[PDB]
Design a protein around this nucleic acid. Sequence first.
RNA 1: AUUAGCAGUUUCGGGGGCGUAAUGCUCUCAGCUGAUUCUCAAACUCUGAACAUUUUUGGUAAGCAGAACUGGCGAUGUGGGUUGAACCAAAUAUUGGGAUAAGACGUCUAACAUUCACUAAUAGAUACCACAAAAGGUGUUAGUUCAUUAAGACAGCAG
RNA 2: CCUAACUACUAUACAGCGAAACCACUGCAAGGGGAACGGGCCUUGCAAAAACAGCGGGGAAAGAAGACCCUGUUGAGCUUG
RNA 3: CGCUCAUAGCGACGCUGCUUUUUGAUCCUUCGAUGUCGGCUCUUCUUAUCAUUGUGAAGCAGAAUUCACAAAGUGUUGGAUUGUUCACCCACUAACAAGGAACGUGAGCUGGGUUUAGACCGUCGUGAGACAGGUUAGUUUUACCCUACUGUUGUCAGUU
RNA 4: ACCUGCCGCUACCAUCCGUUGGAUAAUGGCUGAACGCCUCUAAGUCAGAAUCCAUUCUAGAAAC
Lengths: 348, 185, 250, 128, 144
Amino acid sequence: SHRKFEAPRHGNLGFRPRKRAARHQGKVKSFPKDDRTQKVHLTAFMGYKAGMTHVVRDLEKPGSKMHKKEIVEAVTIIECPPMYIVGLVGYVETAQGLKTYKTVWAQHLSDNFRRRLYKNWYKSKSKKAFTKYVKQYETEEGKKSIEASLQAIKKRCSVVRVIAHTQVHKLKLTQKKAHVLEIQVNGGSIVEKVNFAVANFEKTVNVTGVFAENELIDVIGVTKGKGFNGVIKRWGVRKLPRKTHKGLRKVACIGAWHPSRVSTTVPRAGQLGYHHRVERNKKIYRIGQAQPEDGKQISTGKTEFDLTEKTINPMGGFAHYGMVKHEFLMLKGCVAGPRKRALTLRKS
Amino acid sequence: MKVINSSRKVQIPENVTVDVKGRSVKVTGPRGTLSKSFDHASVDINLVGKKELTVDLWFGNRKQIACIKTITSIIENMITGVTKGYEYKMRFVYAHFPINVAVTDGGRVVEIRNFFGEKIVRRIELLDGITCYRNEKAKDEIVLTGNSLELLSQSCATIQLRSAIKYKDVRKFLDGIYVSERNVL
Amino acid sequence: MSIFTPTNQIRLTNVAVVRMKRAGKRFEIACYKNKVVGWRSGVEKDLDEVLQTHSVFVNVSKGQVAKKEDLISAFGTDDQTEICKQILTKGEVQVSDKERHTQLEQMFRDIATIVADKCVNPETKRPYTVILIERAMKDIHYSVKTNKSTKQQALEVIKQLKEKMKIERAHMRLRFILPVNEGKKLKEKLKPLIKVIESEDYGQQLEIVCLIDPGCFREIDELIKKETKGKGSLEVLNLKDVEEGDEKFE
Amino acid sequence: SNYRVSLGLPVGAVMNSADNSGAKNLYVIAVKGIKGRLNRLPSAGVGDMVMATVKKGKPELRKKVCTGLVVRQRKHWKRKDGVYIYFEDNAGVMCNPKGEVKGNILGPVAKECSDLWPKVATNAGTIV
Amino acid sequence: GRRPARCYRYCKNKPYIKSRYCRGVPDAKIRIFDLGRKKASTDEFPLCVHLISLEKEQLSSEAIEAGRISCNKYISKTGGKDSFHMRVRVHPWHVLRINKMLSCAGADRLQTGMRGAFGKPMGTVARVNIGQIIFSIRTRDNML
RNA sequence: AUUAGCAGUUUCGGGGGCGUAAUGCUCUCAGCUGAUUCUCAAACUCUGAACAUUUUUGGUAAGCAGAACUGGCGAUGUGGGUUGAACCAAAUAUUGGGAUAAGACGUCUAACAUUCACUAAUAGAUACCACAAAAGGUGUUAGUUCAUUAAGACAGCAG
RNA sequence: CCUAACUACUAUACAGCGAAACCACUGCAAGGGGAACGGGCCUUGCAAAAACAGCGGGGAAAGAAGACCCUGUUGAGCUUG
RNA sequence: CGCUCAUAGCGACGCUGCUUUUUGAUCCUUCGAUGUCGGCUCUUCUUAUCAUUGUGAAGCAGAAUUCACAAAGUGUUGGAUUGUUCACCCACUAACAAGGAACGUGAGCUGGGUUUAGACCGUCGUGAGACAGGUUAGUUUUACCCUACUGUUGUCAGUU
RNA sequence: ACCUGCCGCUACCAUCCGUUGGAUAAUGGCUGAACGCCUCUAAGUCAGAAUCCAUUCUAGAAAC
């Protein structure tokens, strides 16, 4: 007849293609909308999810029942080694959308960034990626073309993005391909954004400058891949009873005789995890210091009222991770992806 | 039937000068400039020297004949606003709760707190030719004043519309800020 | 065993039925749900119209129509539209699928009407709601029959609680006090609603009137003279027992 | 008022009536506040007001649909300060519609239940 | 109750009167016809105000009686009775028929479905034509 | 089949008023009679013509059941009605040219120009045919009739 | 409630071997008309290789000249004045 | 009717429609076979709106309630009995609205019912047997094809 | 077989997170004719819905 008893839908359709994410690390597909009131600053970064721990803090929500009282809050530790800025790229607005305009690079391209261009780096004898480009900086008949390339960007186009990349090699996973992405600069007056671009070539940007303290950031990432999973555990479907013949972990009826095809909205068994997802409003509790490669152990997990000279690292280190020896930031609640996964943090 | 010719005539006072260029009337008075387009009419707005302005319509029937008196009276509104502009008087009626009213003059806005004992603050900007001020003399009254009637009466109507009792019986409560007088000078 | 459409089913209906049992057999016919009290009052309802079918039934749930082997033997005739009139007049109204409802809801309509007529409490007498005697009539364990008349059934339920409890079985009287100006539209509302005596109206002082009212109708009249006026109006007792109520035992 | 505690007393769960008024247990038939969600049983946490009947007690109250407070349960809930807690038995105490315990509560009363209801604090011996 | 008069609206049958052959037909709902003073001399009321029908149909007796009461009541409230005299210039002679079938859920068993379909008389009906007067009022000239 | 009165009888059968009481005078009021009056019928008649459209019975109805004349579909395509067993045009050997038929003529799609009104709704656009009614509108266009006015009209503002 | 984890053999991948049912042609939809529920015709929406694992919406899916129902001047088992 | 008051809300006597969620009516498709009740499950559509949002009316003082509009975006329950749809209660609730999808959904399930053969009882029949009466036990087959859907590789009409 | 139990997987059985702009409808209005007056409406115009469209989110095309 009709649906006898009315229940909410099993699953969101705003996440519906449910396939493996094509971005291995998490794509910022939208950046914060630029206002020319503000000064120049970056608006994204790339961390690596070290592990997770829980902290104790005294709540300052007036009116609540927990107020000026201790609360155990879980926090994930996102380890953020400093990001090299290695180029800049212009985007002109067009009727079909923004388009990549001229792409000014830097001169000392690191051998970790040049590993993204190379899928088989070891077979290549002379790694010739960005070698005819860096010789433009040697002469001045090529260096002149860099400035006429750059004055095209600071006059003709509207979005200034720095092509910035990380240092995976500084934290030991097993990876030397340095994760690269564009961070759009968000400040007034495009001739200041390209200024902030070229005044940061070959120099690193720490996470403490992009992201402030006690602020909400968004975490773009790729979730934990759980493979070909059935429909219950994928959608949420109530199990069929004990007596069923062909199997009880199914959607029972996948449609009426009258559309006469299975809708795209019927829960079907398929891929779980490795889904691109963002998570908005994840408040940073603490940005941890870098630990020095020449000097004593900086007590990163030392807080007030604790006075124990200890790291953010637990005993035996973080499980299925190394130690957090570069800058980190610990934000409340969980984020997408397991340990050892590249996360693209983003200002809200 | 569509009549062959149906005109009107607008009398320009001597201190006012109209600058009309193809259904775009622009008065200029002693107290301020005002302009409005009438590009939604098949009408030849046209002035006779210095004292007259003759809205005309060739072969209009109805919905077109009906519009020449409208756009004559709107030019007359623009004229009267720039000789002696309109000044509306708005009065507070309340049952028990005395309505407080704030006014600055950045955007000349009005802010209406303690309306029915609501704690929401009814900040409302005015249309962009308009100022207002409280009446020290007559109690519980704010007088609006401006250069255009379509701005002044609409600002007053927004004060009046945003000063209603909701979810109750409107025949009894009657707390609001209503337009009392509609003078000119 | 696996026929592709299962067989015939019950003949559920919405149609009233009348009984006549003659010569050993039980004959019914289908009628209307209200138009059989439109037939046994002397009123005509056009004998074509009082039936939902003209062919005489053995069993109206089974939908079984009789035959002239057991009809000339039973009635002394075989013409069905004369059979249906004898079954209509000299029968008793039997009951359809809604019998349990039209009997249980009838015996729960009966206690919700006949028990609640005129009953005031002890201790400077006041009326009250219906659910207090819905407690105190199962508490006296009343079994309700319908064939005794409803006025007699009213006089029967209060006999048992005059025997058991201390309750009054008559009218009462009140002395309404109302001010002159803001009480006349309260006067002419209850003046064609209930009976009055001693209409003593002034200009300087208050309208004082006395009443002829049942015991139970007071709680309306305590509130309706305030919810229309909007001020205070005074309830002063006059008398607690007048006859020609149910004290004549009609 | 108070937070979400872990609900571990569904519909059809008997619990010991810790109340000096006459009951020996309380059978929870529905919880006041649960709405919706096809085929989900209405669960009671601690602090909840349940509609309950007595399956064992004084016979003068035994077939009525009465109101009760869940003052302790052995489904472990974490308070938001991080500490968990779970009691030894599920328990209840009869009240009015408003939440007035008219008797004396015995045993420990969870302090997620002496929060919402004042009179459950003023008849408790141990508030834990 | 009565079947909707959209069934018996249009006259598609041969006319069918109460006679020796249509035996047990029920009576008409319009009982009395001519209303007003009606002992009035014809010099008194000079004004003939009619009501003619613009489409041809079967104006049912139940409809003529309701229109009769609706016409009587408004003038009796307006100027009192004897200020008019209307007849009614249509009589319900054509009788309607109903092949009544049971409203039972198992109705295949009982009713001869379209077997001996010839219906039993219900009501009557008046077969008005286009431009046929149904309500003729004679009254004074002060009631136009 | 059937509505309403007016007249005569009218004294009567019943009510009464009237001479003090009655087959004695008059009024509804019954009834018999006469001249009127409203609606009238397949089984009434003085008279009385010339599947689809039409005539036509049962049915509330049906793309239902049954008839009568004619034309079709079945048997039959083709052009049109977007589509289609029956509708319109028009009948089929194989073709070329011309003019046509129904139907159309912004594009699909072969074929147009000029002209007068109506529609201001997201409406409306090929009969069968793929729906729509009673009742409404100070929407607009055309129209009929009646009334008001330089003895100062309606409307506005005032006494 | 309200599902979760674990295990062997399956299924899945490879080497080896290797069938059957079914099959007009065959495979995307909406509305229309039609034999009154189209994959095909009409007008639209559209539409871009070759394949894998699942799955049960459709193919009015397959198995079966419908055991129910009716006809037949077709039978049979049983009963009986 | 609503104290007065036709039209707040209703509304007789009548009339005009719509709907295909009831049951009829008919027999056009299907009898070399469309698996036929209910439930569970799951998705989508409808608006004839129960709640929620914005509003307007009331016999809307406040509260509570009632009528209507734009509204289908989001909800619309747990249970006892019964195979039940329906029904009727208890309890929660913002609300527990009405519906379609081949009376959605049996190569999705269950098989309670209906509906074969066993059997019992009641009434009918001389009897074999009948019941559209009650009871009890009673095999639920196949996807590996095409499409649709869910995922996964893969070809991209100067190379990477 | 029982007791404890890593890693992992897991559960409102545990934890975190789940936005702001524009145009509208209903309707309330403004200026204002038709129709010397009136009128939210006819030309214009204002606020306004869990609505609509974007924002953010998911995929990324015989597109660049």
